[PDB]
């Protein structure tokens, strides 16, 4: 019935452990590319069947590297990750939007063969960390076509972003970096009303609980990309009546659960 439906029925425990498609690794040289500083492109290989595209960022002074976890971990339930290099790790939030675009731009139109094969380049969308989680607002407002965002503890100096986009923001509860109080919430309630959107604030955590294997961002991050970039009803379970014991917030405009 739904064409873009990958794998087999998910578990919550599934979506904390990498996924059944095995994942192929490319580099993209930073000289190789205009626009942005390359990255690695996590896809799936062994398969035959297309997939979803995301772009994401990593934060101020981060590399590609401080995501791979969640580049392999979301390859591996069924998408083609690229998870760019910025062209300075100093570069801003609206310049990390500006090389996300790019790199949206290389993967539907310059990515290798094998990795092509793997895109449905009509179905996009954009994570990212920090100052790149603020720069995954800022093209959710510039490219309404995405078809979800998903900003892990942003940062960005603007609060409010006019975006249609779908949009799950994770907050960590003790950043003091990005705080929430300043950054996540602000960023959550400002988004229109109309706009499908999910807050989820982990326990107990720091800034950089994104930068290594982490349960539920996972779930949320895999949940939010299935049902909004496949499609995927059976990812609705997951971001519904949410009963989390590493949440201590959770806010929605149940947009997606009626």
Not at 7 to 23: I, M, S, W, Y
Not at 71 to 90: D, E, K, P, Q, Y
Not at 148 to 174: C, Y
Request: hydrophobic share 35%; proline share 7%; charged share 15%.
């Amino acid at each position: 019935d739904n064409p873009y439906r990958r794998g087999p029925n998910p578990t919550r425990d599934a979506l904390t452990a990498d996924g059944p498609f095995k994942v192929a690794t490319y580099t993209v040289s930073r000289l190789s590319v205009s626009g942005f500083g390359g990255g690695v492109i996590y896809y799936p290989t062994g398969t035959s069947l297309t997939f979803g595209g995301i772009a994401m960022s990593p934060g101020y002074t981060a590399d590609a590297s401080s995501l791979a976890w969640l580049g392999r971990r979301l390859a591996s339930h069924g998408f083609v990750v690229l998870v760019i290099n910025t062209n300075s790790r100093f570069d801003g939030p609206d310049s990390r939007a500006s090389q996300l675009s790019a790199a949206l731009n290389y993967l539907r139109t310059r990515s290798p063969s094998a990795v092509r094969a793997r895109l449905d380049a009509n179905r996009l969308a954009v994570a990212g960390h920090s100052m790149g989680g603020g720069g995954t607002l800022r093209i959710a407002e510039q490219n309404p076509s995405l078809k979800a965002a998903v900003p892990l503890t942003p940062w960005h100096t603007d609060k409010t972003f006019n975006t249609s986009v779908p949009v799950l923001i994770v907050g960590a509860e003790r950043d003091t970096v990005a705080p929430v109080s300043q950054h996540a919430i602000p960023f959550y309630q400002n988004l229109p009303s109309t706009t499908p959107k999910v807050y989820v604030e982990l326990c107990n955590a720091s800034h950089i609980a994104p930068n290594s294997n982490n349960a539920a961002i996972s779930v949320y991050t895999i949940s939010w990309m299935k049902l909004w970039v496949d499609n995927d009803t059976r990812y609705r379970q997951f971001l519904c009546d949410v009963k989390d014991p590493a949440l201590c917030d959770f806010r929605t405009n149940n947009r997606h659960c009626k």
